[PDB]
Design a binder for these strands. Structure first.
Ligand SMILES: CCC[C@@H]1C[C@@H](C(=O)N[C@@H]([C@H]2O[C@H](SC)[C@H](O)[C@@H](O)[C@H]2O)[C@@H](C)O)N(C)C1
Ligand SMILES: [K+]
Ligand SMILES: [K+]
Ligand SMILES: [K+]
Ligand SMILES: [K+]
Ligand SMILES: [K+]
Ligand SMILES: [K+]
Ligand SMILES: [K+]
Ligand SMILES: [K+]
Ligand SMILES: [K+]
Ligand SMILES: [K+]
Ligand SMILES: [K+]
Ligand SMILES: [K+]
Ligand SMILES: [K+]
Ligand SMILES: [K+]
Ligand SMILES: [K+]
Ligand SMILES: [K+]
Ligand SMILES: [K+]
Ligand SMILES: [K+]
Ligand SMILES: [K+]
Ligand SMILES: [K+]
Ligand SMILES: [K+]
Ligand SMILES: [K+]
Ligand SMILES: [K+]
Ligand SMILES: [K+]
Ligand SMILES: [K+]
Ligand SMILES: [K+]
Ligand SMILES: [K+]
Ligand SMILES: [K+]
Ligand SMILES: [K+]
Ligand SMILES: [K+]
Ligand SMILES: [K+]
Ligand SMILES: [K+]
Ligand SMILES: [K+]
Ligand SMILES: [K+]
Ligand SMILES: [Mg+2]
Ligand SMILES: [Mg+2]
Ligand SMILES: [Mg+2]
Ligand SMILES: [Mg+2]
Ligand SMILES: [Mg+2]
Ligand SMILES: [Mg+2]
Ligand SMILES: [Mg+2]
Ligand SMILES: [Mg+2]
Ligand SMILES: [Mg+2]
Ligand SMILES: [Mg+2]
Ligand SMILES: [Mg+2]
Ligand SMILES: [Mg+2]
Ligand SMILES: [Mg+2]
Ligand SMILES: [Mg+2]
Ligand SMILES: [Mg+2]
Ligand SMILES: [Mg+2]
Ligand SMILES: [Mg+2]
Ligand SMILES: [Mg+2]
Ligand SMILES: [Mg+2]
Ligand SMILES: [Mg+2]
Ligand SMILES: [Mg+2]
Ligand SMILES: [Mg+2]
Ligand SMILES: [Mg+2]
Ligand SMILES: [Mg+2]
Ligand SMILES: [Mg+2]
Ligand SMILES: [Mg+2]
Ligand SMILES: [Mg+2]
Ligand SMILES: [Mg+2]
Ligand SMILES: [Mg+2]
Ligand SMILES: [Mg+2]
Ligand SMILES: [Mg+2]
Ligand SMILES: [Mg+2]
Ligand SMILES: [Mg+2]
Ligand SMILES: [Mg+2]
Ligand SMILES: [Mg+2]
Ligand SMILES: [Mg+2]
Ligand SMILES: [Mg+2]
Ligand SMILES: [Mg+2]
Ligand SMILES: [Mg+2]
Ligand SMILES: [Mg+2]
Ligand SMILES: [Mg+2]
Ligand SMILES: [Mg+2]
Ligand SMILES: [Mg+2]
Ligand SMILES: [Mg+2]
Ligand SMILES: [Mg+2]
Ligand SMILES: [Mg+2]
Ligand SMILES: [Mg+2]
Ligand SMILES: [Mg+2]
Ligand SMILES: [Mg+2]
Ligand SMILES: [Mg+2]
Ligand SMILES: [Mg+2]
Ligand SMILES: [Mg+2]
Ligand SMILES: [Mg+2]
Ligand SMILES: [Mg+2]
Ligand SMILES: [Mg+2]
Ligand SMILES: [Mg+2]
Ligand SMILES: [Mg+2]
Ligand SMILES: [Mg+2]
Ligand SMILES: [Mg+2]
Ligand SMILES: [Mg+2]
Ligand SMILES: [Mg+2]
Ligand SMILES: [Mg+2]
Ligand SMILES: [Mg+2]
Ligand SMILES: [Mg+2]
Ligand SMILES: [Mg+2]
Ligand SMILES: [Mg+2]
Ligand SMILES: [Mg+2]
Ligand SMILES: [Mg+2]
Ligand SMILES: [Mg+2]
Ligand SMILES: [Mg+2]
Ligand SMILES: [Mg+2]
Ligand SMILES: [Mg+2]
Ligand SMILES: [Mg+2]
Ligand SMILES: [Mg+2]
Ligand SMILES: [Mg+2]
Ligand SMILES: [Mg+2]
Ligand SMILES: [Mg+2]
Ligand SMILES: [Mg+2]
Ligand SMILES: [Mg+2]
Ligand SMILES: [Mg+2]
Ligand SMILES: [Mg+2]
Ligand SMILES: [Mg+2]
Ligand SMILES: [Mg+2]
Ligand SMILES: [Mg+2]
Ligand SMILES: [Mg+2]
Ligand SMILES: [Mg+2]
Ligand SMILES: [Mg+2]
Ligand SMILES: [Mg+2]
Lengths: 50, 96, 75
RNA sequence: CCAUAGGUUAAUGAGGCGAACCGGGGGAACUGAAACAUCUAAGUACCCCGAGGAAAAGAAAUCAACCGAGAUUCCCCCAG
RNA sequence: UUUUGUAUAAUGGGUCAGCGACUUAUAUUCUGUAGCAAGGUUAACCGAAUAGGGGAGCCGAAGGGAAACCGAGUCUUAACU
RNA sequence: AGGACCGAACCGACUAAUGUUGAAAAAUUAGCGGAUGACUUGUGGCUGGGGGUGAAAGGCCAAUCAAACCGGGAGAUAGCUGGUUCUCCCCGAAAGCUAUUUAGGUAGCGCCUCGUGAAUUCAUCUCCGGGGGUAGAGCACUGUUUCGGCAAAACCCGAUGCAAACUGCGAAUACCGGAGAAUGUUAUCACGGGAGACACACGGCGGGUGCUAACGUCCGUC
RNA sequence: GUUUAUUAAAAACACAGCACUGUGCAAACACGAAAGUGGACGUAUACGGUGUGACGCCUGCCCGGUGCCGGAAGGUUAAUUGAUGGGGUUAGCGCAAGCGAAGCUCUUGAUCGAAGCCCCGGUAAACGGCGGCCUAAGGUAGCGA
RNA sequence: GAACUCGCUGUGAAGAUGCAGUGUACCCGCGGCAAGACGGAAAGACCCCGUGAACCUUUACUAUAGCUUGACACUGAACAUGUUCUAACGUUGACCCGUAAUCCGGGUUGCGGACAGUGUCUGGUGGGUAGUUUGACUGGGGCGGUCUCCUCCUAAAGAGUAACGGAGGAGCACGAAGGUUGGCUAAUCCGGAGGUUAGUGCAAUGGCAUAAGCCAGCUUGACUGCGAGCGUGACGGCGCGAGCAGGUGCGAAAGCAGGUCAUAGUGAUCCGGUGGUUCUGAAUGGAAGGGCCAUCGCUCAACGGAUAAAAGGUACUCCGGGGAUAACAGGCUGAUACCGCCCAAGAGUUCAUAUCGACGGCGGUGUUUGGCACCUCGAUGUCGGCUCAUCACAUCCUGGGGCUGAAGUAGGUCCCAAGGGUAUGGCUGUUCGCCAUUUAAAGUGGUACGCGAGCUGG
RNA sequence: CCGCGAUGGUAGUGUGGGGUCUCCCCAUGCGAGAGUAGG
């Protein structure tokens, strides 16, 4: 029932993490500061489709 | 490779890589080969004439392997940093 | 309705008292802290105790609760 | 209707046989895949037609790689 | 012979004579042995030639990397304690 | 008149006995059915193999039929069964684990052998350092149990037992490590050439299962 | 009457009779890559297929399932056609980044599109079914250890 | 196979001419009989196994002849967005000729007519036909159950350890239920007692107060690259991990943080999709395609995953095998069965013991139902009857005897006793049983449930 | 640092041997737990 999602870098590098989410309970977009290894900085990552 | 029906090693492991066509037409030359050419100029054609490299070789690199004990002109070959030092120390020269 | 079991996990003491170990070496695999980490011993996420220095394994019973601690005496 | 079909005669040739090789028309399955259907066996076995002392192929609308080679056939490599 | 195990009431053989089952080719690896040795060896073919010629090739003397590429290093990684 | 009746020839084949290395690879003997019919018989002809023909039994198609016979593909394939031929010397298994359309097959590992290399490498004993939760024991815990007392018969207390999935205790042994001697044809480990084996059996000890039944069955260990 | 030549002769097969169904003749159907041939030198009072099995009295209810027959509005749907969008290439335009006509080209797949199926009916001497609230309908006549 | 080829009781791959012990036995024919040589015959037909076969079935799978649909072709002309036309094409209508010809062709004519029909393509239908699949474990097979992962016990105090052994769980959840800093401590009973007897996101075990339990604030370390060393695996793999570099959160800082108390929450490879990319780019520049990095698609659950794609029947059967494995009989066993005994509740007017023996206890036999799978699958014929038997005694009759609730007659019960004896019929394949009628009685068992190289064949 | 305990006996048990072998016994080595005196 938890669905796979991409977290996509806001730095425009195309780097992404993957995780899961319960979209029924939590329909709002997951946003987290995560390390982008391309630019080598912590930047905001935002949910997108897998 | 048959293992009794268990997925065999050469199928449970993934394929990898590709084969380079450029690698097949690239050779390595040892320092010990530099004296074997006729006339003290080392290029693709003189290496081919001396049977050091095959006729379809288009690219060649001189590496630090064996010794060079004579002045040699190397023309139109890549040379390693160590091979360059060895050739120049023996009174040779390298031409791009 | 029975007929099931899980794979045995090879828990227990890997290096006994007085054994010389290199740093990183696993001393005990366990479920929870049946043994506790003393001097120069770390505790992994699965409660594995491992050596953080080269030396000899030492078991000891200390504290008010009278708990089994494992330490490394550095060589 | 002209004619053409058709008819008769003459001349010339063919026909049938033969072990392999050769070109062409058709063309399996067992088997292997540890089952089996894609795949394999194999364009093999076999059937059929045709030829010759050989046959077939053959004188680039071919390769190559900016250098060049120069019809076809066969052998050794390239290379499992 | 087959079996955990056969005097076995498990199998096979009436007897004799003759015949009757790990081969051959090619590739590949290891061992022994011989030659030559940072080299070794030629294939087809030519040659009346077991000679001699023929070194086209093949293996070896360098590796690392998927590869470009670098090279006694190289790959990994922005970079290695 | 009649797929009418009784009954020979003729055509069949219901019963019994015989025969069963027969007189005979289907008969003989005594009886039995049809006997002008959907009858029977001579000669010749036609139908051909996934095909024929069949008042249908998978019947028959040359003593052959749920796919004829002959030749070919062909030495199909056979994880199955059988068999495998002279001599001596040295070493010497396994019947286990893991996986498997796997279970009587096979693969890696274990165990055998040959070669090469290498440490006081290995074993026994003694001493030293260790972790145990088994045997036994016990009843605080988790359950179970009996008696008395006490009392909302609970609870609590005293007394008594029981436990593979109970432990406020806890051996012997075994195992890991260290040190030391003696002994042992390196007995050890690694790498490489060649395997076989992966149906085990009984006996002792510790157990599950079964009835502390089985020359039973399933593990551990000798 | 027929049958398992060679262990079964029968209650099995066939049968006259009955019914359903196909078939308008270059018939259906069958043998045949085909030409043709059988059906038949027959023509629906005929021919094929299927089931039942003289005769007598009879042959009930169920069309939901599967088949067959009829329907044909609607949904769905093939080849075909190639609208539209996206990309590759490059004449150019750009100082460079890039952009980018025509052509060629890779891809996308609008529109068109029959039968079938879904769908709407019929049909049991079609295959079949024929109750303890439920079903398509609950076994009639006759018969019954 | 060779034989100098006896009985018995044991033994023993478990039913012995050949072994042990013992008994008996002069050497050799002939006629007879079939109890044994697990006699001869046929590599068991039953049964199981083999990733064997054949043929048969079907709403198994995949195909396919046939049938059927449309598009384009052969295929044309006038408007309609209707029909008509003739010239392609059809004619198994007529007539004429080749011609001595119910073939064929040509001609003339009628009819039909761009229809029909055929080719290519295409949807449907298609056991009519074809190739195949249709798992394994299993105290025989089948049916049922099971197949991967986690926890406990079995498990013999290191690890590991089997069974169709005993018990339960998983195929997730959570941007907080993660990180850090600070703060807090339960169940239950009546503010106090009590001390984790609660709690853990979910099984069980081992943990947890320094709490891992619980609350709040601030957060994204549920970081990226690596990794000394170690654990665990045949391997593929899986696990634990200080520390190093970069960048981060919390905290005052020390420090802590590479998800969660830990141990389940899973799927190799191939093929392909998406994004990225100092790689590759078949003349060259590009591109396509490939590589590399990130990621996606399996109840492939038969969970090391034969295929993208699969069910059955065979008594019409067939081959290779197995006593590795079932049906008969033997063997081991003796739960069950049958027989005997111990105790004595009681019944029996009274009285436990004439007779019966509750609750319980102990044996014997091999004797029923079974268990096991040791012998036999290169065959050990299997029920009943008939014929012919032979032994045991737990005795049915006849013989001897004790007790009696034995007056007699006739019984009951127990002991001794195996010499001899121990029904015919109706019904049914029956053994048995019921029935009729006998008898002194119509015994119970063993003998391959005696006896098919003796008969029968229900 | 982390709030009991002898002695003796008993249970168990390694090795070897034995029996009437579901369980024991003997030789030798190891030797609890509980409880008792006591602290
Ligand atoms: C419950 C049955 C048990 C099996 C019976 C026996 C067997 O197979 N017998 C054969 C016999 O066939 C013939 S008798 C007609 C032969 O003559 C005879 O020797 C013999 O082979 C047949 C009856 O099946 N087996 C060994 C065990
Ligand atoms: K360790
Ligand atoms: K095939
Ligand atoms: K195979
Ligand atoms: K056997
Ligand atoms: K036999
Ligand atoms: K060799
Ligand atoms: K050599
Ligand atoms: K390095
Ligand atoms: K045939
Ligand atoms: K193996
Ligand atoms: K070896
Ligand atoms: K044992
Ligand atoms: K008859
Ligand atoms: K209907
Ligand atoms: K363009
Ligand atoms: K004797
Ligand atoms: K006899
Ligand atoms: K005409
Ligand atoms: K037409
Ligand atoms: K079993
Ligand atoms: K059994
Ligand atoms: K860090
Ligand atoms: K499997
Ligand atoms: K089948
Ligand atoms: K028997
Ligand atoms: K008795
Ligand atoms: K009395
Ligand atoms: K048998
Ligand atoms: K008798
Ligand atoms: K008496
Ligand atoms: K008697
Ligand atoms: K009989
Ligand atoms: K016999
Ligand atoms: K006889
Ligand atoms: Mg050369
Ligand atoms: Mg286990
Ligand atoms: Mg476990
Ligand atoms: Mg195969
Ligand atoms: Mg000639
Ligand atoms: Mg020619
Ligand atoms: Mg030129
Ligand atoms: Mg056996
Ligand atoms: Mg013996
Ligand atoms: Mg004998
Ligand atoms: Mg024998
Ligand atoms: Mg045999
Ligand atoms: Mg024999
Ligand atoms: Mg290299
Ligand atoms: Mg008559
Ligand atoms: Mg007849
Ligand atoms: Mg007669
Ligand atoms: Mg008559
Ligand atoms: Mg008559
Ligand atoms: Mg039949
Ligand atoms: Mg015949
Ligand atoms: Mg066939
Ligand atoms: Mg062949
Ligand atoms: Mg053969
Ligand atoms: Mg020896
Ligand atoms: Mg496994
Ligand atoms: Mg105990
Ligand atoms: Mg216990
Ligand atoms: Mg030691
Ligand atoms: Mg095996
Ligand atoms: Mg085994
Ligand atoms: Mg076994
Ligand atoms: Mg065993
Ligand atoms: Mg035992
Ligand atoms: Mg046994
Ligand atoms: Mg036993
Ligand atoms: Mg008759
Ligand atoms: Mg017959
Ligand atoms: Mg007969
Ligand atoms: Mg006709
Ligand atoms: Mg009928
Ligand atoms: Mg339509
Ligand atoms: Mg009706
Ligand atoms: Mg009625
Ligand atoms: Mg005997
Ligand atoms: Mg005689
Ligand atoms: Mg006789
Ligand atoms: Mg016999
Ligand atoms: Mg056999
Ligand atoms: Mg048409
Ligand atoms: Mg079909
Ligand atoms: Mg079929
Ligand atoms: Mg096949
Ligand atoms: Mg098959
Ligand atoms: Mg099976
Ligand atoms: Mg253990
Ligand atoms: Mg142990
Ligand atoms: Mg083991
Ligand atoms: Mg085992
Ligand atoms: Mg198990
Ligand atoms: Mg390392
Ligand atoms: Mg593919
Ligand atoms: Mg290019
Ligand atoms: Mg090109
Ligand atoms: Mg790409
Ligand atoms: Mg598996
Ligand atoms: Mg598999
Ligand atoms: Mg057979
Ligand atoms: Mg057996
Ligand atoms: Mg038996
Ligand atoms: Mg009495
Ligand atoms: Mg009683
Ligand atoms: Mg028995
Ligand atoms: Mg057994
Ligand atoms: Mg036997
Ligand atoms: Mg025997
Ligand atoms: Mg025999
Ligand atoms: Mg007596
Ligand atoms: Mg007598
Ligand atoms: Mg007597
Ligand atoms: Mg007397
Ligand atoms: Mg009677
Ligand atoms: Mg008998
Ligand atoms: Mg008897
Ligand atoms: Mg007999
Ligand atoms: Mg009979
Ligand atoms: Mg003491
Ligand atoms: Mg004590």
């Amino acid at each position: 029932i938890r669905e796979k999602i991409k977290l996509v870098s806001s730095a425009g590098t195309g780097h992404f993490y993957t995780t899961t989410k319960n979209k029924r309970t939590k329909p709002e977009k997951l946003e987290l500061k995560k390390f982008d290894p391309v630019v080598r900085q912590h930047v905001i990552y935002k949910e997108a489709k897998i | 490779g048959f293992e009794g029906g268990q997925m065999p090693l050469y199928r449970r492991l993934p394929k990898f890589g590709f084969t380079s066509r450029k690698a097949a037409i690239t050779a390595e030359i040892r320092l010990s080969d530099l004296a074997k050419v006729e006339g003290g100029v080392v290029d693709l054609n003189t290496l081919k004439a001396a049977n050091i490299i095959g006729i379809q070789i288009e690219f060649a690199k001189v590496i630090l392997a064996g010794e060079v004990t004579t002045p040699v002109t190397v023309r139109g070959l890549r040379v390693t940093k160590g091979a360059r030092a060895a050739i120049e120390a023996a009174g040779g020269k390298i031409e791009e | 309705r029975n007929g099931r079991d899980s794979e045995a996990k090879r828990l227990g003491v890997k290096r006994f008292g007085g054994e010389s170990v290199l740093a990183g070496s696993i001393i005990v695999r366990q479920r929870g802290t049946k043994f506790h980490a003393g001097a120069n011993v770390g505790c992994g996420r699965d409660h594995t105790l491992f050596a953080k220095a080269d030396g000899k394994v030492k078991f000891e019973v200390k504290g008010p609760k009278n708990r089994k601690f494992i330490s490394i005496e550095a060589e």
